[PDB]
Ligand SMILES: CC(C)CCC[C@@H](C)[C@H]1CC[C@H]2[C@@H]3CC=C4C[C@@H](O)CC[C@]4(C)[C@H]3CC[C@]12C
């Protein structure tokens with residue numbers, strides 16, 4: 048009195064016999080309606096957008112219906128007119144069938160359209176409910192596969208103008224994929240465990256709820272494995288072995304994308320934060336180990352009277368290990384930021400408009416002293432263009448170049 | 458590797474099954490555990506993933522010793538085969554593959570010296586917010602992989618801009634970006650190079666390659682030196698009348714400067730006249746509002762109506778300014794003796810012809 | 813170029829090329845396609861392009877028969893005796 052084979056074989060034949068028919072045909076006014084169906088379901092059309100939003104919402108509803116019905120016996124008789132929840136489910140299913148037909152009549156190629164995820168979930172969803180309403184006896188089958196539509200969720204978030212950047216869209220896509228595969232693996236485990244082994248007259252059934260199977264999958268994939276719940280049936284244990292192996296492979300395949308979305312942390316980004324009752328000096332120019340070491344040795348002398356002045360270094364070249372150690376030794380008085388004086392955004396970052404002074408150090412060991420002097424004069428011009436009233440102390444290599452400083456009215 | 462993994466899994470399961478079902482010999486085989494072979498396969502898989510449910514486990518002393526050895530040896534074996542797994546996985550090519558065409562949407566191939574500044578300026582003018590809706594995508598083709606700044610800039614325009622690693626001189630890469638269906642190819646030059654002539658020759662060779670692949674595609678190229686663009690006339694597929702253009706940077710820049718020497722501010726006027734500028738409403742009495750009133754103007758070309766034929770240029774210009782509120786600057790004069798020539802503000806002796 | 817007593821298209825030239833893929837840039841009347849091999853292009857078949865890479869094949873030809881190089885040298889260099 049268990050005719051689940053009919054429900055399974057319905058999906059099997061609707062997936063295989065029609066594919067074989069298409070293959071046989073290939074081995075051997077419709078254009079207008081095909082183009083109309085293609086433009087009707089196109090993503091550029093507003094009708095296509097509202098229709099895919101509607102089908103996403105109805106797939107969510109079907110998933111909730113499966114969640115409600117999972118607490119019931121898997122294969123049981125029911126009446127068409129005695130409950131309207133099954134009527135809602137079959138209305139959803141016939142809407143899915145109509146949308147599948149619209150996609151099928153608008154498909155440029157039949158074989159590739161017949162071998163995609165939406166087609167196979169429709170094949171495993173709609174013929175079972177047709178057989179159920181024909182025989183007036185339902186079977187909880189592969190209805191969890193509707194969760195596989197959650198992958199399209201990010202696309203909906205792109206149609207609603209909620210997601211704009213590419214990184215957020217890809218993050219939502221990966222999260223949706225992970226959640227959907229988790230839910231569908233839990234559904235397979237729940238079905239195989241609660242049904243029992245067929246060759247042993249279904250005497251191996253284990254009364255596990257769907258959420259206990261979700262919990263089991265989460266405990267397994269973290270490699271924690273409490274053993275409070277586990278699969279007891281032979282086919283369930285085979286499914287768990289396959290799930291462990293496939294999940295290991297899938298996690299290994301998605302490591303580079305996780306690394307890419309994590310990215311690299313900028314060590315010396317961000318902006319200086321002012322402290323009330325405390326001045327700061329911006330230091331720029333040729334920032335290396337020796338010049339900074341000498342300047343800090345005299346400026347932060349132990350015999351110097353208590354002065355509440357912080358030092359903010361601004362330099363585009365990232366410091367090496369020795370400069371990093373030197374900055375760490377004075378971590379309570381010295382901060383470093385990566386940036387250029389010639390960029391006004393970086394000047395706003397170090398709060399040059401409230402700094403007490405700007406000190407510009409020169410490269411004493413350079414091939415062309417005149418080029419170094421001109422670069423420093425241009426730094427002075429940039430700083431004074433941003434804030435004309437700030438005090439500037441600069442280093443000049445050659446004597447004839449400092450006359451250029453008199454050409455700056457600030 | 459797959460065969461090695463499967464074989465060692467099966468033989469470890471066989472050892473565990475034998476030792477567990479036989480029992481300990483020194484205790485008269487009273488420690489036997491009735492485990493099937495497939496339960497031992499399942500046990501080995503659960504162990505080597507470090508999940509360890511504990512629903513099934515080895516109970517005998519020799520079985521537990523075998524399991525300890527299996528854990529240690531499997532750890533060592535997995536550690537030894539990591540480099541081979543990495544090698545077979547390899548490195549994913551970030552910018553491989555081919556451009557996929559979309560029906561009812563044109564695309565432009567951009568090549569040459571592709572860096573941050575040139576791409577930024579071109580995209581700032583091309584993808585302007587005030588630009589009328591144009592369904593044109595941009596496909597960059599360049600052998601040098603982009604850096605972090607170019608990657609961020611391409612990500613900001615991920616819905617309109619795609620990048621591909623490849624060379625213009627390679628016909629496979631030209632087939633990848635679908636140069637045979639592109640609306641145009643735009644070649645940018647390296648303005649900061651040691652030898653401008655070498656850069657110009659390289660760009661001319663890129664033009665030769667593109668025209669050899671597809672002779673009918675429209676090409677807009679940048680030329681550094683003026684004497685080099687004559688080489689473009691040696692290409693029989695190069696058609697100036699069909700839209701092929703060379704923009705000479707030196708000639709145009711120094712001509713702008715010379716005309717501003719004759720009348721200062723002319724370079725600013727011309728640059729604002731062909732650039733897209735967003736209009737800003739100013740109500741304060743400053744010079745910015747008077748400036749921005751005239752910034753919004755642009756150049757257009759139109760065929761004169763048949764009612765203007767036989768009339769002098771000053772008459773039609775005054776009619777356009779007073780009635781139509783349009784400033785007509787120049788006309789295109791055609792003749793049988795010579796080619797078409799652009800006439801800037803011709804005198805009253807000239808008369809408007811047909812078309 | 814154009815000449816008066818008429819065009820440079822009939823002037824016989826030979827061009828040395830380093831890359832074989834650049835041979836099809838030398839001719840415009842060719843009906844060749846991008847996938848055409850070097851020896852089937854018009855510039856190669858007409859002798860107006862010399863690809864240096866052919867010498868790389870000569871080494872292999874020398875391995876299977878050492879007299880080929882001697883014949884080529886005595887036919888090509890003009891008769892240079894030892
Ligand atoms: C990719 C998927 C759709 C194809 C794999 C086939 C799956 C769906 C099939 C193959 C074997 C099937 C199982 C075989 C036997 C039974 C016992 C019975 O009480 C119904 C459910 C259950 C437990 C079946 C569920 C569906 C099942 C797991």
Ligand SMILES: CC(C)CCC[C@@H](C)[C@H]1CC[C@H]2[C@@H]3CC=C4C[C@@H](O)CC[C@]4(C)[C@H]3CC[C@]12C
Pocket residue numbers: 475476479480481482
């Ligand atoms: C390289 C491999 C072949 C060498 C490993 C040694 C093998 C041959 C030996 C070492 C100890 C042996 C076990 C010792 C005791 C018993 C109990 C008895 O009921 C027979 C099987 C069993 C369980 C033996 C199986 C074979 C065994 C595992």
Ligand SMILES: [K+]
Pocket residue numbers: 271272273274508509510511
């Ligand atoms: K454990």
Ligand SMILES: [K+]
Pocket residue numbers: 273274275510511512
């Ligand atoms: K345990």
Ligand SMILES: [K+]
Pocket residue numbers: 272273274509510511
């Ligand atoms: K455990």
Ligand SMILES: [K+]
Pocket residue numbers: 729730731732733734752753754755
């Ligand atoms: K303008």
